[PDB]
Amino acid sequence: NYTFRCLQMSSFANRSWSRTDSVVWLGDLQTHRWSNDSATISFTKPWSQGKLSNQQWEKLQHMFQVYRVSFTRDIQELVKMMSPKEDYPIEIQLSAGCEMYPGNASESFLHVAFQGKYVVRFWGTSWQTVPGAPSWLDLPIKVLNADQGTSATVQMLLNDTCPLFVRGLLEAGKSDLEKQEKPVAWLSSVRQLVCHVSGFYPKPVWVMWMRGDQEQQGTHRGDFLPNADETWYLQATLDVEAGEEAGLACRVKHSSLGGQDIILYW
């Protein structure tokens, strides 16, 4: 059950300066990047082309090359159209792609944020504002919806190209998507004890302080933090009375261990 996400970030500082950067995620693995500095989209995995032929890929990349330049001028031109209602600096974010379900099913999406707020999506055959959006966006929407060629292209990307492409990626990237990497754990204190757990993939993990078989309900999990090698880091803290540290263990469960839990006693 995997979600494919193309994430675009565009900064427009004044009328003459802008940059657009993209990253692409399949689940929590990066498949592509496209720096503003690069003319071409970069693969960040061997299998990032999926099952697309070289000619299909070139066509798709070319359409995106046209889009990035076209997008950039359209925003600048929309800013002039609303002037002086909105002005620079401006941040635009796109989140687009599809979630793949069992069988042959998928939902595609394309959400647009303006200065950090979700304001616009593509839905059905047209752009629309979402609840909470300012009314001035109705003019940009009117103008964007007049472009039938863009409407038809986006519908084809969302309905057909995206789920087809992603099916191929799932096949081509199976052995990376299904990788198992073992956590390693260690202990420390500041009284607040800390169980550090690092190097595990995939994300699901269970971490608890123990006094033998008694689960300590005071255990607090921090956030999942990334490592540079596409594994995860997590820590579990427990607040205790000084001199009560004897008898406490940290227990870790993860799919990569094949039943053989890590147990570290203080």
Epitope: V66, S70, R73, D74, E77, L78, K80, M81, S83, K142, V143, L144, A146, D147, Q148, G149, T150
Partner: T-cell receptor
């Protein structure tokens, strides 16, 4: 959808002030000024997305634009010169791609 | 320039057919319009071509568009004296008011009566 220009023809002197006007009763937000010189295609001078908006085109130098209302878009040559001898075309449009052109204005700037 | 027209000019006898070419580098290319401009007059639209491989007609005028080759032709069947005019090719780079128009310099046709 109709567009009119006045004057249709004008002889002017170097250093004079010339104002070319475009009127448009379609309730179009967008208006556009071009000049046509033999050996080139029409080139965009200035344009406007609504009352009070004026934007630089490809060749704006020597011209000032003015959009006082939705109906009228004017092209102002503050200090006219012989190089501004041309045929000027105005156009209007709504959110669609079609620009509806006026009949053109012939300007000759003499020394 | 981004829009090139050929021939620069041509002279044909009344009743003859002729072909006018337009080649462009404009990107992207939403649509291409052919204009007829009589001497000292305005721009009269003859046809607009919008598809990847498109064909249109308007009486004695017919046109093709091939977006892959970035090429259009205007065909005039059985020229009349009133076809004496300049014929102008224009490429719109958007399907909306956000677009810019890219004008060719035109082809001068003279029809001998």
């Amino acid at each position: 959808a109709a567009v009119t220009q006045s004057p249709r023809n004008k002889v002017a002197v170097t250093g004079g002030k010339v104002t070319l006007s475009c009127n448009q009763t379609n309730n179009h937000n967008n208006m556009y000024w071009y000049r046509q010189d033999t050996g080139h295609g029409l080139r965009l001078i200035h344009y406007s997305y609504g009352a009070g908006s004026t934007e630089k085109g490809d060749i704006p130098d020597g011209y000032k634009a003015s959009r006082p209302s939705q109906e009228n878009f004017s092209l102002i040559l503050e200090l006219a010169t012989p190089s501004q001898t041309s045929v000027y075309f105005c156009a209007s449009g709504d959110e669609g791609y079609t620009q509806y052109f006026g009949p053109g204005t012939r300007l000759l700037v003499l020394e | 320039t981004q829009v090139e027209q050929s021939p620069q000019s041509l002279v044909v006898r009344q009743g003859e057919n002729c072909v006018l070419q337009c080649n462009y580098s404009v990107t992207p290319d939403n649509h291409l319009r052919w204009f007829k401009q009589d001497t000292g007059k305005g721009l009269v639209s003859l046809t607009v071509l919008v598809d990847q491989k498109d064909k249109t007609s308007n009486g004695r005028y017919s046109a093709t568009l091939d977006k892959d080759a970035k090429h259009s032709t205007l065909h005039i069947t059985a020229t009349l004296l009133d076809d004496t005019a300049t014929y102008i090719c224009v490429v719109g780079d958007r399907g909306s008011a956000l677009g810019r128009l890219h004008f060719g310099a035109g082809t001068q046709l003279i029809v001998i009566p």
